[PDB]
Structure 1
Amino acid sequence: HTIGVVTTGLSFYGPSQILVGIERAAREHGYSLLLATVHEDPDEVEEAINTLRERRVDGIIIVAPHNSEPPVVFLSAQPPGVPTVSVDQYAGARLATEHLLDLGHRRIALITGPQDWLEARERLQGWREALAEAGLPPPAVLQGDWSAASGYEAARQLLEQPDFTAIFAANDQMALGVLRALHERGLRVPDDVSVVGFDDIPESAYFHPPLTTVRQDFEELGRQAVEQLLEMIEGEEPPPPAVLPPELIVRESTAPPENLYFQ
Protein backbone atom coordinates (compact mmCIF):
# COMPACT_ATOMS: atom_id res chain seq x y z
CA HIS A 1 0.00 0.00 0.00
CA THR A 2 1.51 3.29 1.21
CA ILE A 3 4.30 4.37 3.55
CA GLY A 4 4.23 7.91 4.91
CA VAL A 5 7.53 9.76 5.20
CA VAL A 6 7.96 12.89 7.33
CA THR A 7 10.98 14.91 6.23
CA THR A 8 12.36 18.43 6.26
CA GLY A 9 12.47 20.58 3.15
CA LEU A 10 13.76 18.92 -0.01
CA SER A 11 16.57 21.52 -0.11
CA PHE A 12 18.63 19.36 2.28
CA TYR A 13 20.31 16.81 0.03
CA GLY A 14 21.38 14.32 2.69
CA PRO A 15 17.76 13.77 3.76
CA SER A 16 16.86 13.80 0.07
CA GLN A 17 19.13 10.80 -0.47
CA ILE A 18 17.34 9.12 2.42
CA LEU A 19 14.08 9.53 0.49
CA VAL A 20 15.71 7.83 -2.49
CA GLY A 21 16.72 4.92 -0.27
CA ILE A 22 13.27 4.65 1.28
CA GLU A 23 11.64 4.72 -2.16
CA ARG A 24 13.90 1.97 -3.54
CA ALA A 25 13.13 -0.46 -0.71
CA ALA A 26 9.44 0.47 -0.58
CA ARG A 27 9.00 0.06 -4.34
CA GLU A 28 10.64 -3.38 -3.97
CA HIS A 29 7.78 -4.36 -1.62
CA GLY A 30 4.85 -2.78 -3.47
CA TYR A 31 4.64 0.31 -1.25
CA SER A 32 4.15 3.92 -2.36
CA LEU A 33 5.59 6.96 -0.59
CA LEU A 34 3.31 9.58 0.96
CA LEU A 35 5.32 12.79 1.39
CA ALA A 36 4.85 15.28 4.21
CA THR A 37 7.38 18.01 4.96
CA VAL A 38 7.87 20.07 8.13
CA HIS A 39 9.71 23.30 8.96
CA GLU A 40 11.28 23.66 12.42
CA ASP A 41 7.97 23.55 14.34
CA PRO A 42 8.09 20.54 16.72
CA ASP A 43 4.30 20.23 16.60
CA GLU A 44 4.48 19.98 12.80
CA VAL A 45 6.03 16.51 13.19
CA GLU A 46 3.17 15.41 15.46
CA GLU A 47 0.53 16.96 13.20
CA ALA A 48 2.10 15.26 10.16
CA ILE A 49 1.82 11.85 11.84
CA ASN A 50 -1.88 12.57 12.39
CA THR A 51 -2.58 13.48 8.75
CA LEU A 52 -0.73 10.38 7.50
CA ARG A 53 -2.73 8.25 9.94
CA GLU A 54 -5.91 9.92 8.67
CA ARG A 55 -4.84 8.91 5.15
CA ARG A 56 -4.80 5.18 6.05
CA VAL A 57 -1.03 4.85 5.85
CA ASP A 58 0.38 1.47 6.83
CA GLY A 59 3.53 2.89 8.41
CA ILE A 60 5.32 6.15 9.04
CA ILE A 61 9.03 6.92 8.75
CA ILE A 62 10.32 10.15 10.31
CA VAL A 63 13.42 11.50 8.58
CA ALA A 64 13.09 14.97 10.08
CA PRO A 65 14.76 15.71 13.44
CA HIS A 66 12.27 15.50 16.31
CA ASN A 67 12.97 14.68 19.96
CA SER A 68 10.07 12.35 20.78
CA GLU A 69 8.21 13.72 23.82
CA PRO A 70 0.29 2.69 12.29
CA PRO A 71 3.83 1.71 13.34
CA VAL A 72 6.45 4.44 13.36
CA VAL A 73 10.22 4.31 12.75
CA PHE A 74 12.40 7.34 13.42
CA LEU A 75 15.64 7.96 11.54
CA SER A 76 17.27 9.76 14.48
CA ALA A 77 18.34 8.58 17.93
CA GLN A 78 15.22 8.55 20.14
CA PRO A 79 14.36 6.95 23.54
CA PRO A 80 14.87 3.16 23.62
CA GLY A 81 11.09 2.67 23.52
CA VAL A 82 10.98 4.34 20.07
CA PRO A 83 12.20 2.28 17.06
CA THR A 84 15.15 4.09 15.47
CA VAL A 85 17.59 3.59 12.60
CA SER A 86 20.26 6.29 12.73
CA VAL A 87 23.90 7.07 11.94
CA ASP A 88 26.43 7.69 14.72
CA GLN A 89 26.82 11.44 14.23
CA TYR A 90 29.38 11.67 17.03
CA ALA A 91 31.62 9.01 15.49
CA GLY A 92 31.43 10.60 12.04
CA ALA A 93 32.59 13.99 13.31
CA ARG A 94 35.43 12.31 15.21
CA LEU A 95 36.71 10.36 12.19
CA ALA A 96 36.78 13.64 10.26
CA THR A 97 38.56 15.68 12.95
CA GLU A 98 40.96 12.84 13.76
CA HIS A 99 41.75 12.49 10.05
CA LEU A 100 42.69 16.17 9.96
CA LEU A 101 44.67 15.84 13.19
CA ASP A 102 46.55 12.82 11.83
CA LEU A 103 47.71 14.81 8.81
CA GLY A 104 49.29 17.47 11.03
CA HIS A 105 46.51 20.05 11.24
CA ARG A 106 46.12 21.73 14.60
CA ARG A 107 43.81 24.71 13.90
CA ILE A 108 40.74 22.95 12.44
CA ALA A 109 37.73 25.28 12.23
CA LEU A 110 34.25 23.78 12.59
CA ILE A 111 31.17 24.92 10.68
CA THR A 112 28.00 23.35 12.10
CA GLY A 113 24.40 23.38 11.02
CA PRO A 114 21.65 24.86 13.18
CA GLN A 115 22.18 24.15 16.87
CA ASP A 116 18.51 23.24 17.39
CA TRP A 117 19.36 20.08 15.42
CA LEU A 118 19.39 17.31 18.02
CA GLU A 119 22.63 15.75 16.72
CA ALA A 120 24.31 19.05 15.82
CA ARG A 121 25.72 19.01 19.35
CA GLU A 122 26.75 15.41 18.69
CA ARG A 123 28.84 16.72 15.79
CA LEU A 124 30.25 19.53 17.93
CA GLN A 125 31.17 17.06 20.68
CA GLY A 126 33.00 14.76 18.26
CA TRP A 127 35.07 17.69 17.01
CA ARG A 128 35.73 19.28 20.40
CA GLU A 129 36.68 16.05 22.16
CA ALA A 130 38.97 14.98 19.30
CA LEU A 131 40.92 18.21 19.81
CA ALA A 132 40.78 17.41 23.53
CA GLU A 133 42.69 14.12 23.35
CA ALA A 134 45.20 15.91 21.10
CA GLY A 135 45.67 18.60 23.78
CA LEU A 136 44.69 21.49 21.53
CA PRO A 137 42.73 24.64 22.30
CA PRO A 138 39.46 24.88 20.36
CA PRO A 139 39.53 26.83 17.07
CA ALA A 140 36.62 28.82 15.70
CA VAL A 141 33.10 27.40 15.49
CA LEU A 142 30.58 29.04 13.19
CA GLN A 143 26.96 28.41 12.30
CA GLY A 144 25.37 27.48 8.97
CA ASP A 145 21.90 26.26 7.90
CA TRP A 146 22.97 23.26 5.77
CA SER A 147 23.10 25.59 2.73
CA ALA A 148 26.05 26.46 0.51
CA ALA A 149 25.36 30.17 1.09
CA SER A 150 26.03 29.82 4.82
CA GLY A 151 29.07 27.65 4.14
CA TYR A 152 30.42 30.46 1.97
CA GLU A 153 29.47 33.13 4.52
CA ALA A 154 30.99 31.17 7.40
CA ALA A 155 34.23 30.59 5.48
CA ARG A 156 34.69 34.27 4.58
CA GLN A 157 34.09 35.09 8.24
CA LEU A 158 36.85 32.66 9.23
CA LEU A 159 38.94 34.30 6.51
CA GLU A 160 38.70 37.60 8.41
CA GLN A 161 41.10 36.06 10.97
CA PRO A 162 42.89 33.44 8.84
CA ASP A 163 44.47 31.29 11.57
CA PHE A 164 43.13 27.93 10.33
CA THR A 165 44.55 25.24 8.04
CA ALA A 166 41.47 23.00 7.83
CA ILE A 167 37.69 23.45 7.78
CA PHE A 168 35.25 20.72 8.84
CA ALA A 169 31.79 21.48 7.45
CA ALA A 170 28.75 19.75 8.92
CA ASN A 171 27.40 18.82 5.50
CA ASP A 172 28.55 18.67 1.90
CA GLN A 173 26.47 21.61 0.64
CA MET A 174 28.06 23.90 3.24
CA ALA A 175 31.43 22.42 2.28
CA LEU A 176 30.79 23.43 -1.33
CA GLY A 177 30.34 27.01 -0.10
CA VAL A 178 33.57 26.74 1.89
CA LEU A 179 35.46 25.70 -1.24
CA ARG A 180 33.99 28.62 -3.14
CA ALA A 181 35.21 31.15 -0.56
CA LEU A 182 38.74 29.67 -0.56
CA HIS A 183 39.02 29.54 -4.36
CA GLU A 184 37.78 33.12 -4.60
CA ARG A 185 40.48 34.40 -2.22
CA GLY A 186 43.05 32.33 -4.12
CA LEU A 187 43.80 29.69 -1.47
CA ARG A 188 44.46 26.18 -2.78
CA VAL A 189 42.57 23.12 -1.55
CA PRO A 190 44.19 21.11 -0.05
CA ASP A 191 47.61 22.82 -0.43
CA ASP A 192 46.67 25.88 1.61
CA VAL A 193 43.51 24.74 3.42
CA SER A 194 41.96 21.28 3.72
CA VAL A 195 38.19 20.87 3.73
CA VAL A 196 36.17 17.95 5.07
CA GLY A 197 32.40 17.52 4.76
CA PHE A 198 29.48 15.39 5.99
CA ASP A 199 27.10 13.11 4.10
CA ASP A 200 28.49 11.65 0.90
CA ILE A 201 25.89 13.22 -1.40
CA PRO A 202 26.55 11.97 -4.96
CA GLU A 203 27.69 15.44 -6.06
CA SER A 204 30.55 15.66 -3.55
CA ALA A 205 32.81 13.33 -5.55
CA TYR A 206 32.59 15.95 -8.34
CA PHE A 207 33.29 19.11 -6.35
CA HIS A 208 36.49 21.02 -7.12
CA PRO A 209 38.50 19.32 -5.69
CA PRO A 210 36.66 16.00 -5.02
CA LEU A 211 35.57 16.35 -1.41
CA THR A 212 36.77 14.27 1.51
CA THR A 213 33.68 13.66 3.60
CA VAL A 214 31.92 11.45 6.12
CA ARG A 215 29.55 9.07 4.35
CA GLN A 216 26.15 8.43 5.86
CA ASP A 217 24.83 5.37 4.04
CA PHE A 218 21.47 6.97 3.23
CA GLU A 219 20.52 4.07 0.94
CA GLU A 220 21.15 1.50 3.65
CA LEU A 221 19.45 3.81 6.15
CA GLY A 222 16.32 3.97 4.00
CA ARG A 223 16.51 0.21 3.45
CA GLN A 224 16.70 -0.62 7.16
CA ALA A 225 13.86 1.79 7.93
CA VAL A 226 11.53 0.06 5.48
CA GLU A 227 12.53 -3.43 6.63
CA GLN A 228 11.86 -2.66 10.31
CA LEU A 229 8.62 -0.88 9.47
CA LEU A 230 7.45 -3.72 7.26
CA GLU A 231 7.93 -6.33 9.98
CA MET A 232 5.95 -4.17 12.42
CA ILE A 233 3.25 -3.89 9.75
CA GLU A 234 2.97 -7.67 9.30
CA GLY A 235 2.92 -8.26 13.06
CA GLU A 236 6.26 -8.34 14.86
CA GLU A 237 7.98 -6.77 17.84
CA PRO A 238 10.00 -3.64 17.01
CA PRO A 239 13.61 -4.56 16.17
CA PRO A 240 16.19 -2.95 18.46
CA PRO A 241 17.35 0.63 17.87
CA ALA A 242 19.88 0.27 15.05
CA VAL A 243 22.92 2.53 14.60
CA LEU A 244 24.78 2.63 11.26
CA PRO A 245 28.53 3.28 11.21
CA PRO A 246 29.59 6.37 9.27
CA GLU A 247 32.53 5.95 6.88
CA LEU A 248 35.17 8.57 6.04
CA ILE A 249 35.68 8.86 2.27
CA VAL A 250 39.06 10.45 1.52
CA ARG A 251 39.32 12.06 -1.90
CA GLU A 252 41.37 15.14 -2.88
CA SER A 253 40.26 17.98 -0.55
CA THR A 254 42.64 16.99 2.29
CA ALA A 255 46.42 16.99 2.78
CA PRO A 256 49.02 17.84 5.42
CA PRO A 257 49.00 21.57 6.18
CA GLU A 258 52.40 22.08 4.51
CA ASN A 259 54.50 19.91 2.21
CA LEU A 260 55.99 17.04 4.22
CA TYR A 261 59.22 16.92 2.17
CA PHE A 262 59.91 20.26 0.43
CA GLN A 263 58.14 22.37 3.09
Structure 2
Amino acid sequence: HTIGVVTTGLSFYGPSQILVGIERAAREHGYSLLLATVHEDPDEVEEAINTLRERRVDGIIIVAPHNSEEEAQLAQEAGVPPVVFLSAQPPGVPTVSVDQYAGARLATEHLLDLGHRRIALITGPQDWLEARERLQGWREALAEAGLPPPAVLQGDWSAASGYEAARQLLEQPDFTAIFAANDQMALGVLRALHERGLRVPDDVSVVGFDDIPESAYFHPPLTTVRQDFEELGRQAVEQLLEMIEGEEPPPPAVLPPELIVRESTAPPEN
Protein backbone atom coordinates (compact mmCIF):
# COMPACT_ATOMS: atom_id res chain seq x y z
CA HIS A 1 0.00 0.00 0.00
CA THR A 2 2.29 2.75 1.31
CA ILE A 3 6.06 3.24 1.35
CA GLY A 4 7.90 5.34 3.91
CA VAL A 5 10.87 7.56 3.13
CA VAL A 6 13.33 9.18 5.54
CA THR A 7 15.58 11.92 4.18
CA THR A 8 17.35 15.19 4.97
CA GLY A 9 16.25 18.65 3.87
CA LEU A 10 19.70 19.81 2.77
CA SER A 11 20.77 21.97 -0.16
CA PHE A 12 23.36 19.46 -1.43
CA TYR A 13 22.59 17.91 -4.81
CA GLY A 14 21.18 14.39 -4.76
CA PRO A 15 18.43 13.79 -2.18
CA SER A 16 15.65 15.78 -3.87
CA GLN A 17 16.51 14.13 -7.20
CA ILE A 18 16.53 10.67 -5.60
CA LEU A 19 13.06 11.45 -4.24
CA VAL A 20 11.83 12.14 -7.78
CA GLY A 21 12.86 8.60 -8.71
CA ILE A 22 11.17 7.20 -5.60
CA GLU A 23 7.96 9.10 -6.36
CA ARG A 24 7.99 7.93 -9.98
CA ALA A 25 8.64 4.25 -9.25
CA ALA A 26 6.32 3.96 -6.24
CA ARG A 27 3.44 5.57 -8.14
CA GLU A 28 3.97 3.17 -11.05
CA HIS A 29 3.64 0.15 -8.74
CA GLY A 30 0.53 1.58 -7.05
CA TYR A 31 2.27 2.80 -3.88
CA SER A 32 2.09 6.16 -2.14
CA LEU A 33 4.95 7.79 -0.25
CA LEU A 34 5.04 8.64 3.46
CA LEU A 35 7.78 11.24 3.83
CA ALA A 36 9.43 11.97 7.19
CA THR A 37 12.48 14.22 6.96
CA VAL A 38 14.98 14.16 9.83
CA HIS A 39 18.31 15.64 10.87
CA GLU A 40 21.75 13.99 10.72
CA ASP A 41 21.37 12.03 13.95
CA PRO A 42 21.15 8.26 14.55
CA ASP A 43 18.51 8.68 17.27
CA GLU A 44 16.24 10.65 14.94
CA VAL A 45 16.79 7.99 12.27
CA GLU A 46 15.62 5.20 14.59
CA GLU A 47 12.53 6.98 15.94
CA ALA A 48 11.56 8.08 12.45
CA ILE A 49 11.34 4.36 11.64
CA ASN A 50 9.20 3.84 14.74
CA THR A 51 6.81 6.68 13.87
CA LEU A 52 6.57 5.51 10.24
CA ARG A 53 5.86 1.95 11.38
CA GLU A 54 2.91 3.60 13.16
CA ARG A 55 1.16 4.15 9.83
CA ARG A 56 0.57 1.07 7.65
CA VAL A 57 3.86 1.31 5.76
CA ASP A 58 4.79 -1.79 3.74
CA GLY A 59 8.47 -0.79 3.38
CA ILE A 60 10.81 2.14 4.03
CA ILE A 61 13.74 3.61 2.08
CA ILE A 62 16.54 5.43 3.93
CA VAL A 63 18.00 8.36 1.99
CA ALA A 64 19.62 10.09 4.98
CA PRO A 65 23.30 9.05 5.10
CA HIS A 66 24.46 6.83 7.95
CA ASN A 67 28.02 5.39 7.84
CA SER A 68 30.00 2.29 7.02
CA GLU A 69 28.84 1.26 10.53
CA GLU A 70 25.08 0.95 10.08
CA GLU A 71 24.96 -2.57 11.53
CA ALA A 72 27.09 -1.70 14.58
CA GLN A 73 24.65 0.98 15.77
CA LEU A 74 21.52 -1.09 16.56
CA ALA A 75 20.17 0.29 13.27
CA GLN A 76 20.36 -2.73 10.95
CA GLU A 77 20.28 -5.33 13.74
CA ALA A 78 17.12 -3.74 15.15
CA GLY A 79 15.54 -3.13 11.73
CA VAL A 80 14.17 -6.45 10.47
CA PRO A 81 11.08 -5.21 8.54
CA PRO A 82 11.99 -4.30 4.94
CA VAL A 83 14.54 -1.47 4.85
CA VAL A 84 16.87 -0.49 2.01
CA PHE A 85 19.84 1.81 2.61
CA LEU A 86 21.03 4.48 0.19
CA SER A 87 24.47 4.31 1.80
CA ALA A 88 27.61 2.19 1.49
CA GLN A 89 27.75 -0.57 4.11
CA PRO A 90 26.99 -4.03 2.74
CA PRO A 91 28.08 -6.81 5.08
CA GLY A 92 24.64 -8.33 4.46
CA VAL A 93 22.65 -5.10 4.21
CA PRO A 94 20.77 -4.66 0.89
CA THR A 95 21.98 -1.31 -0.44
CA VAL A 96 21.97 0.67 -3.67
CA SER A 97 24.53 3.35 -4.49
CA VAL A 98 26.56 5.05 -7.20
CA ASP A 99 30.12 3.78 -7.72
CA GLN A 100 32.04 6.87 -6.61
CA TYR A 101 35.49 5.35 -7.12
CA ALA A 102 34.65 4.29 -10.68
CA GLY A 103 33.32 7.77 -11.42
CA ALA A 104 36.50 9.46 -10.27
CA ARG A 105 38.48 6.99 -12.39
CA LEU A 106 36.40 7.94 -15.44
CA ALA A 107 37.10 11.63 -14.85
CA THR A 108 40.83 11.21 -14.23
CA GLU A 109 41.38 8.69 -17.04
CA HIS A 110 39.58 11.06 -19.43
CA LEU A 111 42.26 13.65 -18.67
CA LEU A 112 45.11 11.12 -18.72
CA ASP A 113 43.97 9.87 -22.12
CA LEU A 114 44.14 13.47 -23.40
CA GLY A 115 47.81 13.61 -22.34
CA HIS A 116 47.59 15.36 -18.95
CA ARG A 117 50.13 14.45 -16.24
CA ARG A 118 49.65 17.27 -13.73
CA ILE A 119 45.99 16.78 -12.85
CA ALA A 120 45.28 18.64 -9.62
CA LEU A 121 42.32 17.63 -7.44
CA ILE A 122 39.87 19.85 -5.58
CA THR A 123 38.62 17.14 -3.26
CA GLY A 124 35.41 17.03 -1.26
CA PRO A 125 34.91 17.32 2.48
CA GLN A 126 36.63 14.65 4.53
CA ASP A 127 33.56 13.46 6.43
CA TRP A 128 31.80 12.33 3.23
CA LEU A 129 32.62 8.80 2.10
CA GLU A 130 31.83 9.89 -1.47
CA ALA A 131 34.59 12.50 -1.22
CA ARG A 132 37.14 10.02 0.11
CA GLU A 133 36.30 7.47 -2.58
CA ARG A 134 36.64 10.05 -5.35
CA LEU A 135 40.10 10.99 -4.10
CA GLN A 136 41.06 7.31 -4.09
CA GLY A 137 39.89 6.92 -7.69
CA TRP A 138 41.91 9.95 -8.80
CA ARG A 139 45.02 8.79 -6.93
CA GLU A 140 44.88 5.24 -8.27
CA ALA A 141 44.17 6.26 -11.87
CA LEU A 142 47.32 8.40 -11.69
CA ALA A 143 49.31 5.62 -10.01
CA GLU A 144 48.32 3.13 -12.72
CA ALA A 145 49.64 5.58 -15.32
CA GLY A 146 52.96 5.66 -13.45
CA LEU A 147 52.39 9.11 -11.98
CA PRO A 148 52.61 10.57 -8.48
CA PRO A 149 49.66 12.54 -7.08
CA PRO A 150 49.80 16.23 -7.98
CA ALA A 151 48.48 18.96 -5.70
CA VAL A 152 45.27 18.34 -3.75
CA LEU A 153 43.21 20.93 -1.89
CA GLN A 154 40.02 20.16 -0.01
CA GLY A 155 36.78 22.10 -0.43
CA ASP A 156 33.34 21.72 1.12
CA TRP A 157 31.10 21.18 -1.98
CA SER A 158 30.49 24.95 -2.41
CA ALA A 159 31.45 27.05 -5.41
CA ALA A 160 33.10 29.44 -2.95
CA SER A 161 35.42 26.70 -1.69
CA GLY A 162 36.32 25.66 -5.24
CA TYR A 163 37.25 29.26 -6.06
CA GLU A 164 39.37 29.65 -2.92
CA ALA A 165 41.13 26.32 -3.52
CA ALA A 166 41.84 27.12 -7.18
CA ARG A 167 43.27 30.50 -6.16
CA GLN A 168 45.65 28.74 -3.78
CA LEU A 169 46.63 26.24 -6.49
CA LEU A 170 47.40 29.19 -8.77
CA GLU A 171 50.13 30.38 -6.42
CA GLN A 172 52.06 27.38 -7.84
CA PRO A 173 50.57 26.85 -11.32
CA ASP A 174 52.09 23.36 -11.73
CA PHE A 175 48.97 21.85 -13.30
CA THR A 176 47.42 21.54 -16.75
CA ALA A 177 44.08 20.16 -15.53
CA ILE A 178 41.84 20.28 -12.47
CA PHE A 179 39.44 17.54 -11.41
CA ALA A 180 36.92 19.18 -9.07
CA ALA A 181 35.04 16.68 -6.93
CA ASN A 182 31.65 18.24 -7.69
CA ASP A 183 30.13 20.59 -10.23
CA GLN A 184 29.58 23.46 -7.79
CA MET A 185 33.26 23.51 -6.81
CA ALA A 186 34.10 23.28 -10.52
CA LEU A 187 32.12 26.47 -11.12
CA GLY A 188 34.32 28.29 -8.61
CA VAL A 189 37.43 26.79 -10.22
CA LEU A 190 36.33 28.20 -13.58
CA ARG A 191 35.96 31.68 -12.06
CA ALA A 192 39.43 31.54 -10.49
CA LEU A 193 40.93 30.48 -13.83
CA HIS A 194 39.10 33.16 -15.83
CA GLU A 195 40.10 35.84 -13.32
CA ARG A 196 43.73 34.80 -13.91
CA GLY A 197 43.30 35.24 -17.67
CA LEU A 198 43.51 31.48 -18.28
CA ARG A 199 41.43 29.85 -21.01
CA VAL A 200 39.40 26.68 -20.44
CA PRO A 201 40.27 24.26 -21.98
CA ASP A 202 43.08 25.91 -24.01
CA ASP A 203 45.24 26.62 -20.94
CA VAL A 204 43.64 24.41 -18.26
CA SER A 205 41.15 21.54 -18.60
CA VAL A 206 38.44 21.09 -15.95
CA VAL A 207 36.22 18.12 -15.06
CA GLY A 208 33.44 18.10 -12.45
CA PHE A 209 31.20 15.53 -10.79
CA ASP A 210 27.35 15.17 -10.48
CA ASP A 211 26.02 16.50 -13.79
CA ILE A 212 23.77 18.98 -12.02
CA PRO A 213 21.28 20.61 -14.44
CA GLU A 214 23.32 23.82 -14.49
CA SER A 215 26.59 22.17 -15.57
CA ALA A 216 25.72 22.16 -19.28
CA TYR A 217 25.37 25.95 -18.98
CA PHE A 218 28.69 26.79 -17.33
CA HIS A 219 31.27 28.76 -19.30
CA PRO A 220 32.39 26.56 -20.99
CA PRO A 221 29.88 23.68 -20.73
CA LEU A 222 31.36 21.36 -18.16
CA THR A 223 32.60 17.83 -18.74
CA THR A 224 31.42 15.95 -15.65
CA VAL A 225 30.43 12.58 -14.19
CA ARG A 226 26.68 11.91 -14.05
CA GLN A 227 25.16 10.51 -10.88
CA ASP A 228 21.80 9.15 -12.03
CA PHE A 229 19.98 9.98 -8.80
CA GLU A 230 16.52 9.35 -10.27
CA GLU A 231 17.58 5.84 -11.28
CA LEU A 232 19.01 5.44 -7.77
CA GLY A 233 15.59 6.05 -6.22
CA ARG A 234 13.84 3.90 -8.82
CA GLN A 235 16.17 0.99 -8.06
CA ALA A 236 15.59 1.67 -4.35
CA VAL A 237 11.88 1.00 -4.87
CA GLU A 238 12.55 -1.97 -7.17
CA GLN A 239 14.91 -3.55 -4.63
CA LEU A 240 12.46 -2.92 -1.78
CA LEU A 241 9.53 -4.56 -3.58
CA GLU A 242 11.34 -7.90 -3.81
CA MET A 243 11.50 -7.87 0.00
CA ILE A 244 7.91 -6.66 0.47
CA GLU A 245 6.41 -9.54 -1.53
CA GLY A 246 9.05 -11.95 -0.21
CA GLU A 247 12.43 -12.81 -1.74
CA GLU A 248 16.05 -13.31 -0.73
CA PRO A 249 18.25 -10.39 0.35
CA PRO A 250 19.57 -9.26 -3.04
CA PRO A 251 23.18 -8.39 -3.82
CA PRO A 252 24.10 -4.78 -3.01
CA ALA A 253 23.34 -2.95 -6.26
CA VAL A 254 25.99 -0.58 -7.62
CA LEU A 255 25.07 1.97 -10.28
CA PRO A 256 27.91 2.71 -12.73
CA PRO A 257 28.30 6.43 -13.42
CA GLU A 258 28.66 7.90 -16.89
CA LEU A 259 31.11 10.50 -18.16
CA ILE A 260 29.35 13.40 -19.89
CA VAL A 261 31.84 14.98 -22.31
CA ARG A 262 31.16 18.65 -23.06
CA GLU A 263 33.55 21.54 -23.82
CA SER A 264 35.87 21.97 -20.80
CA THR A 265 38.68 19.52 -21.70
CA ALA A 266 41.38 19.32 -24.38
CA PRO A 267 44.96 18.03 -24.65
CA PRO A 268 47.49 20.03 -22.64
CA GLU A 269 49.15 22.92 -24.42
CA ASN A 270 52.73 22.77 -25.67
* CA–CA distance in structure 1, aligned partners of residues 47 and 162 of structure 2: 32
Deviation at 1:57, TM superposition (A): 3.1
Query: In 1, are the aligned partners of 2:6 and 2:38 still within 8 Å (CA)?
Result: yes
* CA–CA distance in structure 1, aligned partners of residues 173 and 215 of structure 2: 25
Query: In 1, are the aligned partners of 2:116 and 2:268 still within 8 Å (CA)?
Result: yes
Closer, same or farther: CA 132–223 of 1 in aligned 2, 3 Å: same
Q: Deviations over 1:185-215 (max 9, x none)?
A: 2221111111111112222122221111111
**Secondary structure of the structure 2 residue equivalent to 1:119:** helix
**Residue 186 of structure 2 is aligned with which of 175, 183, 206?**
175
Deviation at 1:42, TM superposition (A): 4.5
* CA–CA distance in structure 2, aligned partners of residues 146 and 56 of structure 1: 38
Closer, same or farther: CA 185–65 of 1 in aligned 2, 3 Å: same
* CA–CA distance in structure 1, aligned partners of residues 134 and 236 of structure 2: 23
* CA–CA distance in structure 1, aligned partners of residues 48 and 154 of structure 2: 28
**Residue 136 of structure 1 is aligned with which of 134, 147, 154?**
147
Deviation at 1:44, TM superposition (A): 4.2
Does 94-103 or 250-259 show the bigger shift?
250-259
Identical residues among aligned pairs (%): 100
Deviation at 1:38, TM superposition (A): 4.8
Deviation at 1:43, TM superposition (A): 4.3
In angstroms, what is the RMSD of aligned CA positions? 2.1
Query: In 2, are the aligned partners of 1:86 and 1:244 still within 8 Å (CA)?
Result: yes
Closer, same or farther: CA 143–47 of 1 in aligned 2, 3 Å: farther
Does 144-153 or 5-14 show the bigger shift?
5-14
Q: TM-score, normalised by structure 2?
A: 0.86
Closer, same or farther: CA 188–52 of 1 in aligned 2, 3 Å: farther
Deviation at 1:90, TM superposition (A): 0.9
Closer, same or farther: CA 235–197 of 1 in aligned 2, 3 Å: same
Matching residue of 2:89: 78
Does 149-158 or 101-110 show the bigger shift?
149-158
Query: In 2, are the aligned partners of 1:144 and 1:150 still within 8 Å (CA)?
Result: yes
Deviation at 1:63, TM superposition (A): 2.4
Does 245-254 or 148-157 show the bigger shift?
148-157
**Secondary structure of the structure 2 residue equivalent to 1:86:** strand
Q: Deviations over 1:222-259 (max 9, x none)?
A: 11111111222223323221111111111101111116
* CA–CA distance in structure 2, aligned partners of residues 16 and 123 of structure 1: 22
* CA–CA distance in structure 1, aligned partners of residues 22 and 67 of structure 2: 21
Matching residue of 1:191: 202
Query: In 1, are the aligned partners of 2:119 and 2:178 still within 8 Å (CA)?
Result: yes
Unaligned runs of 5+ in 2: 69-80
Count of aligned pairs between the two proteins? 258
Q: Deviations over 1:140-179 (max 9, x none)?
A: 2222222222222222222222222211111112222222
Unaligned runs of 5+ in 1: none
Closer, same or farther: CA 184–229 of 1 in aligned 2, 3 Å: same
Q: Deviations over 1:53-88 (max 9, x none)?
A: 3444332222233225x4111122212311111111
Query: In 1, are the aligned partners of 2:2 and 2:34 still within 8 Å (CA)?
Result: yes
Query: In 2, are the aligned partners of 1:65 and 1:117 still within 8 Å (CA)?
Result: no
Query: In 1, are the aligned partners of 2:90 and 2:252 still within 8 Å (CA)?
Result: no
Does 40-49 or 165-174 show the bigger shift?
40-49
